[PDB]
């Protein structure tokens, strides 16, 4: 399991990296844009925020396969081992094949269907990123798409990994993980919810009270 | 997973070969007929349209096992590594056994039943092609036949492959792939649908607009 | 069950009306555009092609609720008992509410999600038309959407009817009918595949042979 | 099915009331407080924003059953037909019983468990509102709780209705409706997602474009 | 649904009676012993603990049908409308028949098996009380016995009611109610757990905190 | 639910008829033979030992339909309201049709499959008796046969009743009852096991022990 | 998968042996008898008619184990590597154990139950032959018996093989193959049906017509 | 799969051992009692009845761990390699641990629950013997228990074997085997039913008849 | 399987360690507080109570990751090989990473959700302990959580073990074991119920009575 945060918030990443067992950070264009720092600024910052380890992801912007390959080369010049996200469109598929021939690792993103995602993996993508919540919002089942995609990769491209993305609630992430997703990337709010629970807090408070009641202190 | 296109449209194969990760092109007698070019023309053209690589399939026309085997020999003289499609009839089965002895790889085609398919695999066919949409159109369940056939091959002829064929909608293709089909062949309309999604276009445009608003350009 | 054809082909409708037990004809803006005849010609012609009986459907075009209400009155002035199709968008939902209050029967169309469809029924629509094959083409499940939607109407709008539409294969129509759709509209190709079967024709021919054989003719 | 908005945003309620077939508006202490207008201001504003019809909900703040009854009366004096939301705690249950005896309609809220919910209905509550996303966020299954609660009400308190609440994604709302909830309240973002889809916009645009292109007209 | 407490703790019954919508109190010989007061003292006290209303249950001690009937009469002379609990043994069944002839309502108790329970109802028992937790503790499935019992009664003795008893956790109680039990009796510890939740208390507190933040207090 | 004993043990019927709520007694040739008394002796005695009220069943011996109607008349001359058991064989089915025309009630017995059983109900039998254990013993599923038969009667002969017979263990009886059998006949050993349980006896003794510990006596 | 024909029709076997991939021919005493040729005549004729290779099966007639052993030796002296079919009776079981000691391969035949079949494998039978259609015809489920048997062998006698037999329709053979049977033997009529399909013939005819239409011939 | 007879009937064991593939014989205190011969007489006779091979089981009678160990040594002094059956009680568990330290193989018997069974395997028992029919007779599911137990040993004590015991009907035996029991012990009645079937006898008779008609004799 | 007692009752641990096959003892702050002895007294005692063998667990009290690590070192200086329980909160997760780096084995405790559990394992916890009964009590499903948790560890952290804890009834423990938990800790009451069954005692009693009746004593 590779656990990622889906963010460009460098400060939050450094703070959460001591808490969570993080494999890295994923970004996309909207997330980069929301943070306002350019790629060649934020990427190295995010790399530093995890102590110079872990895996980063960032997305091409060009519209033609050749442009996307050139984006990829730029991105790799910024972080030498970065994984390059390519949206799974006709040209994106073409770019994924060309990038496979160049030894540049890719992830097929903006995946709204299982077959589509599979095709990215067959073209060479190492990761495929279905947009779970988007699919849920638009009247589908993100979980079924994921389940299906995961089945397809397991049968048809077993070195490729699902990187489940787009979350509004912890339950979605849980269901992706239950479906066997080898990787997942969480926005900050959902990640925080996943480790903070009133029932857990009440259990700890209770241990503290019982311990006080018998020993006159709450410390060991 | 071997992905094929089911077409005799040479220009289209040239264009789509850079997009899709194609293992090759399949043809059948109707598909050749629709293209109007003879086999000894269209086949080499198809081979060159995939840059001199990949696998082709073409179908015998004779009615007797002996004729089918001569048909096979002619097809091989056109494309040396072609896989010969034989309809899974009585004579077809005999032809498949004969061609197995000769080392000419075959596909058992026009399969409308699971046991029928299995018989072609036991007789020697490397591939078995159920006609998914014809089974659906004629009041059956193409997906159930594909599921049953796959189970049968996996248990009883584990080196034979299902090459699902005959599609009107991506959902059929998806379901064949979810059933574990090792290979598949798509007509051009369904292949195009499988990589074109309004929800994907909208996601990519939103990325473009957010990037424009933050950085004043749409390039990286 | 109300069985419709999805066509503006008057000649085909007349010929097929003596074979199928039709409840009428559905049109939509592209179907009408293809046929090149304006509505005030095609609609009465379709009405006539079914001997003055049956039910018709045609779609509004305007972008605003007010516009769509005016489109509906115009449609009603061409065919007085026509059911007006309204796309299930925000403005369309507003139009459906207004049309309910004016006693003008509506169908909620362009339905790609269950909840969307349910909303059109709760706003007053008498029919809800999911686009089965489009949902299938775009990596969803047409059949699950139809099932979900039908369950939603039966629980929460029990007098509203599903009118399943958008078909590439008889299997989609069969599954919609098995799911309990109260109505359905078939394009001409799917409708004709629904009544033509090689096995049936073989059975009938065998009957003829055996009769010839015992009686010296194929007639009674 | 009764459809509510979960909001204190008067301008948004008025705008959306012409689109959706709304039964009313629900509020709770957090929603009221984010709007900053006090109850004696917002509630009549919300009532008017729906043309003085439909149903309203608001929540008691007191911690004692006696206080809760007194808060009910304050609420009823602002809106004579309001439904009073009572959290389902020990004191809340006691208060629901007292309110039942006074003929003041209640809703048992802050429901995180099915049996808890049932108790509130058995005590007299007309609606039971499980917090769907809260249960999902905290490592449960909000849908399973709704399913269970709905089953329990149907068997044991058949005149009580589930009013499903707490949504981050349309999929949650869909699953609540499929589970048979008689009522539901949506925050505005989920409601807007529920009627806005790229695939639907693409379908409608294609009709528009095909229409003018047969008929140079943007309507009928 | 009839809700009982399973207890001889009069003060507790009084307190809990304002909170829960109680139908009454059940007792058994161990619960009477543990409270130390004899029946002619506690039953009237428990009756008064509920404002002279609701239903009470108490168990016969005799070994023979005859003795069990005389135990019943002594119980009825203490509380005129008490329901008499008879263990479902051979003599218990004989006793239930006799008591039915006398018009004295019974409950078949100490039920460890579904068919056993069914026999008690067919003999005239108005209620049947499977010992859910004891079945669980002894290597069976309390919930399945309950489920089987309820099916049997619904098919074969539809006016007979299940009264589920013997609980160490709310989950068992929940499962019984999900299975359709028409009545249930909870020990005090389980009942208290059924209305007290860390997550519910956290939700109330957050309401208070936001109300404070916007209005300068925690009251309406 | 009609509960029968499957026996010719007059003394045992007397005793057990006060414990169980019997509908009456079934016999068959092997059960009569084993008790050694002729039909004209036991049948009257069994009629009296179930306290003069209930149904009796006994079986014909002839091998032709005509002979079977004669046996039916002889049995009726012993017990005028007796139900006549006819083995469901070809001659038996013929006899069942005759007896139906004569207004003499039948039970189609020696039923080892579901369709066989249904045929007897279509011919006129009021009861159908599958031999459950016998089907189990000979490598089938008695419970599945009963389930299928019950289904068939319910759909196809809804006034006919299953009378499940042939039991070696209570589980078999329980499963027959779960499957909705309207009636059942138990041999004495299985009946006795159905009301005798060590866990039940231990609950009662615990109650006597706790009672006497608190009160110094065992009586109420 | 070993595919056998269930026949003594030597001429038919010669014909079908070039079409099907046969492992062999099974016989039994009714099949031999129906052919009129004694064993020492037909068994060598069948050995030839396959092509001189493969596996033969013939059944013992004796009634004691010792005589079945002498039947085994007689059969073996006609065809040295014949597999001896022994009915799974008590004496057949005893014969199977002796034959195992003597190293003569057996098949346990006339199996109507799964446990019975299992016992034959635990005794030493290499093959176990349930009679599928006999089980179906007699009110059981031949498919369930085969499925159960195959499970029993797989867990408890994994080197023994189900040889599914007794068929009236291809569907029975399909379900046996789908249940995982390692071998199967078909009567000639069911085998012919398994490779002859109106739908397949119709598909080949259409290819021929389309090819004719484009190239003016029906040859390649 | 180890197949055992549950019996102290020496003569029957000798006869049955030539029919069944027996692993040995199991006894318990009741089966020894019923045969009336003491342990030092029957155990050697049963051994010799299997020609001095296979495995024997006998049960301890003492009531404490220490006394059970002494009994184990007494049994071992009668038959040097006997498997000692220890009832799975608190003291029995302790005994099982000691006997493991002393290298004497044990069977955990009198098992009525899956977890209890498991504890006996965890304590050192090689076999665990659930009393299937006793669980059935007492209102449980012997089969669910066996399934659960087999699951537990497979996960948590994989060298330990289930030895299913206590049968009144072949079906129970069949279901134990389908649930994967490594061993089983049958009473002589059940065992005999497991090899005797009317349908099988009818099939063998039909073979004889057909043989007679073709060849004028019933031998080979 | 590792079997633990959840207790600080030294005497009970000594006595139960001769009955159960214990892997050790678990403690938590409430269990330590209830036994009233400080850690440096009970932990050594508990260790001795198991003959100086097996594994122990004890829980940190501090609120910061750093405090928690310091608590870990204190616990390790009392028992060198102890496993340190760390509540799975944000700080607990950070502590678990640190302890992993220091090579001190941990258990992630106070687990109320499956994802929370998995995070503790991904951070390096060797054991994960969901509070089964607390989840049950608070309206969830402890078994579903355990099941989900176990699936996550198996797919994503296969070296981590579920240590199921918090039990009010043996059924919960059974279901945890059936879900595949590698380890489990039982409170004393539940452990005792797991080895004491009235049905088992009656089976033993019966064996003694049959032995007496045959041999005149109850001993061997």
PDB file of N, CA and C in Angstrom, chain D residues 162-197:
ATOM      1  N   UNK D 162     -37.816   8.151   7.938  1.00  0.00           N
ATOM      2  CA  UNK D 162     -36.412   8.517   7.978  1.00  0.00           C
ATOM      3  C   UNK D 162     -36.214   9.821   7.213  1.00  0.00           C
ATOM      4  N   UNK D 163     -35.517  10.765   7.822  1.00  0.00           N
ATOM      5  CA  UNK D 163     -35.077  11.969   7.105  1.00  0.00           C
ATOM      6  C   UNK D 163     -33.556  11.950   7.061  1.00  0.00           C
ATOM      7  N   UNK D 164     -33.039  11.485   5.934  1.00  0.00           N
ATOM      8  CA  UNK D 164     -31.629  11.273   5.834  1.00  0.00           C
ATOM      9  C   UNK D 164     -30.942  12.614   5.625  1.00  0.00           C
ATOM     10  N   UNK D 165     -29.810  12.776   6.319  1.00  0.00           N
ATOM     11  CA  UNK D 165     -29.073  14.026   6.404  1.00  0.00           C
ATOM     12  C   UNK D 165     -27.566  13.772   6.462  1.00  0.00           C
ATOM     13  N   UNK D 166     -26.776  14.828   6.214  1.00  0.00           N
ATOM     14  CA  UNK D 166     -25.299  14.800   6.323  1.00  0.00           C
ATOM     15  C   UNK D 166     -24.721  14.121   5.080  1.00  0.00           C
ATOM     16  N   UNK D 167     -24.428  14.941   4.073  1.00  0.00           N
ATOM     17  CA  UNK D 167     -24.019  14.482   2.741  1.00  0.00           C
ATOM     18  C   UNK D 167     -22.810  15.255   2.261  1.00  0.00           C
ATOM     19  N   UNK D 168     -21.833  14.509   1.744  1.00  0.00           N
ATOM     20  CA  UNK D 168     -20.707  15.079   1.010  1.00  0.00           C
ATOM     21  C   UNK D 168     -20.746  14.745  -0.484  1.00  0.00           C
ATOM     22  N   UNK D 169     -21.534  13.745  -0.882  1.00  0.00           N
ATOM     23  CA  UNK D 169     -21.565  13.292  -2.256  1.00  0.00           C
ATOM     24  C   UNK D 169     -22.948  12.779  -2.632  1.00  0.00           C
ATOM     25  N   UNK D 170     -23.412  13.066  -3.877  1.00  0.00           N
ATOM     26  CA  UNK D 170     -24.678  12.549  -4.379  1.00  0.00           C
ATOM     27  C   UNK D 170     -24.872  11.050  -4.180  1.00  0.00           C
ATOM     28  N   UNK D 171     -23.829  10.257  -4.410  1.00  0.00           N
ATOM     29  CA  UNK D 171     -23.882   8.824  -4.170  1.00  0.00           C
ATOM     30  C   UNK D 171     -24.474   8.436  -2.786  1.00  0.00           C
ATOM     31  N   UNK D 172     -24.080   9.140  -1.742  1.00  0.00           N
ATOM     32  CA  UNK D 172     -24.698   8.936  -0.446  1.00  0.00           C
ATOM     33  C   UNK D 172     -26.213   9.151  -0.479  1.00  0.00           C
ATOM     34  N   UNK D 173     -26.650  10.236  -1.107  1.00  0.00           N
ATOM     35  CA  UNK D 173     -28.071  10.587  -1.188  1.00  0.00           C
ATOM     36  C   UNK D 173     -28.811   9.553  -1.983  1.00  0.00           C
ATOM     37  N   UNK D 174     -28.203   9.156  -3.101  1.00  0.00           N
ATOM     38  CA  UNK D 174     -28.765   8.078  -3.945  1.00  0.00           C
ATOM     39  C   UNK D 174     -28.980   6.796  -3.128  1.00  0.00           C
ATOM     40  N   UNK D 175     -27.964   6.377  -2.395  1.00  0.00           N
ATOM     41  CA  UNK D 175     -28.047   5.144  -1.629  1.00  0.00           C
ATOM     42  C   UNK D 175     -29.103   5.258  -0.525  1.00  0.00           C
ATOM     43  N   UNK D 176     -29.285   6.451   0.031  1.00  0.00           N
ATOM     44  CA  UNK D 176     -30.330   6.657   1.022  1.00  0.00           C
ATOM     45  C   UNK D 176     -31.716   6.506   0.392  1.00  0.00           C
ATOM     46  N   UNK D 177     -31.874   7.093  -0.781  1.00  0.00           N
ATOM     47  CA  UNK D 177     -33.106   6.975  -1.478  1.00  0.00           C
ATOM     48  C   UNK D 177     -33.375   5.532  -1.916  1.00  0.00           C
ATOM     49  N   UNK D 178     -32.365   4.821  -2.396  1.00  0.00           N
ATOM     50  CA  UNK D 178     -32.548   3.441  -2.795  1.00  0.00           C
ATOM     51  C   UNK D 178     -32.924   2.574  -1.597  1.00  0.00           C
ATOM     52  N   UNK D 179     -32.460   2.957  -0.415  1.00  0.00           N
ATOM     53  CA  UNK D 179     -32.792   2.243   0.804  1.00  0.00           C
ATOM     54  C   UNK D 179     -34.204   2.541   1.240  1.00  0.00           C
ATOM     55  N   UNK D 180     -34.878   3.484   0.584  1.00  0.00           N
ATOM     56  CA  UNK D 180     -36.288   3.713   0.864  1.00  0.00           C
ATOM     57  C   UNK D 180     -36.647   4.894   1.778  1.00  0.00           C
ATOM     58  N   UNK D 181     -35.677   5.741   2.126  1.00  0.00           N
ATOM     59  CA  UNK D 181     -35.954   6.906   2.951  1.00  0.00           C
ATOM     60  C   UNK D 181     -37.102   7.720   2.403  1.00  0.00           C
ATOM     61  N   UNK D 182     -38.042   8.019   3.289  1.00  0.00           N
ATOM     62  CA  UNK D 182     -39.224   8.764   2.949  1.00  0.00           C
ATOM     63  C   UNK D 182     -38.933  10.242   2.783  1.00  0.00           C
ATOM     64  N   UNK D 183     -37.811  10.703   3.327  1.00  0.00           N
ATOM     65  CA  UNK D 183     -37.417  12.121   3.254  1.00  0.00           C
ATOM     66  C   UNK D 183     -35.905  12.271   3.296  1.00  0.00           C
ATOM     67  N   UNK D 184     -35.421  13.418   2.835  1.00  0.00           N
ATOM     68  CA  UNK D 184     -33.997  13.655   2.726  1.00  0.00           C
ATOM     69  C   UNK D 184     -33.678  15.148   2.716  1.00  0.00           C
ATOM     70  N   UNK D 185     -32.570  15.551   3.318  1.00  0.00           N
ATOM     71  CA  UNK D 185     -32.237  16.956   3.232  1.00  0.00           C
ATOM     72  C   UNK D 185     -30.836  17.135   2.707  1.00  0.00           C
ATOM     73  N   UNK D 186     -30.698  17.952   1.670  1.00  0.00           N
ATOM     74  CA  UNK D 186     -29.425  18.094   0.963  1.00  0.00           C
ATOM     75  C   UNK D 186     -28.785  19.437   1.236  1.00  0.00           C
ATOM     76  N   UNK D 187     -27.496  19.443   1.574  1.00  0.00           N
ATOM     77  CA  UNK D 187     -26.773  20.718   1.505  1.00  0.00           C
ATOM     78  C   UNK D 187     -26.728  21.179   0.058  1.00  0.00           C
ATOM     79  N   UNK D 188     -26.498  22.465  -0.148  1.00  0.00           N
ATOM     80  CA  UNK D 188     -26.606  23.046  -1.488  1.00  0.00           C
ATOM     81  C   UNK D 188     -25.602  22.510  -2.508  1.00  0.00           C
ATOM     82  N   UNK D 189     -24.379  22.220  -2.089  1.00  0.00           N
ATOM     83  CA  UNK D 189     -23.403  21.749  -3.049  1.00  0.00           C
ATOM     84  C   UNK D 189     -23.799  20.356  -3.628  1.00  0.00           C
ATOM     85  N   UNK D 190     -24.295  19.471  -2.760  1.00  0.00           N
ATOM     86  CA  UNK D 190     -24.731  18.141  -3.204  1.00  0.00           C
ATOM     87  C   UNK D 190     -25.968  18.225  -4.087  1.00  0.00           C
ATOM     88  N   UNK D 191     -26.899  19.078  -3.706  1.00  0.00           N
ATOM     89  CA  UNK D 191     -28.049  19.335  -4.540  1.00  0.00           C
ATOM     90  C   UNK D 191     -27.644  19.816  -5.914  1.00  0.00           C
ATOM     91  N   UNK D 192     -26.714  20.751  -6.000  1.00  0.00           N
ATOM     92  CA  UNK D 192     -26.343  21.291  -7.324  1.00  0.00           C
ATOM     93  C   UNK D 192     -25.671  20.216  -8.200  1.00  0.00           C
ATOM     94  N   UNK D 193     -24.825  19.384  -7.590  1.00  0.00           N
ATOM     95  CA  UNK D 193     -24.168  18.262  -8.277  1.00  0.00           C
ATOM     96  C   UNK D 193     -25.208  17.278  -8.829  1.00  0.00           C
ATOM     97  N   UNK D 194     -26.272  17.083  -8.065  1.00  0.00           N
ATOM     98  CA  UNK D 194     -27.346  16.161  -8.413  1.00  0.00           C
ATOM     99  C   UNK D 194     -28.141  16.543  -9.676  1.00  0.00           C
ATOM    100  N   UNK D 195     -28.037  17.784 -10.145  1.00  0.00           N
ATOM    101  CA  UNK D 195     -28.741  18.205 -11.359  1.00  0.00           C
ATOM    102  C   UNK D 195     -27.840  18.789 -12.429  1.00  0.00           C
ATOM    103  N   UNK D 196     -26.541  18.640 -12.240  1.00  0.00           N
ATOM    104  CA  UNK D 196     -25.565  19.176 -13.169  1.00  0.00           C
ATOM    105  C   UNK D 196     -24.552  18.084 -13.539  1.00  0.00           C
ATOM    106  N   UNK D 197     -24.578  17.658 -14.803  1.00  0.00           N
ATOM    107  CA  UNK D 197     -23.718  16.591 -15.308  1.00  0.00           C
ATOM    108  C   UNK D 197     -23.134  16.956 -16.676  1.00  0.00           C
TER     109      UNK D 197
END
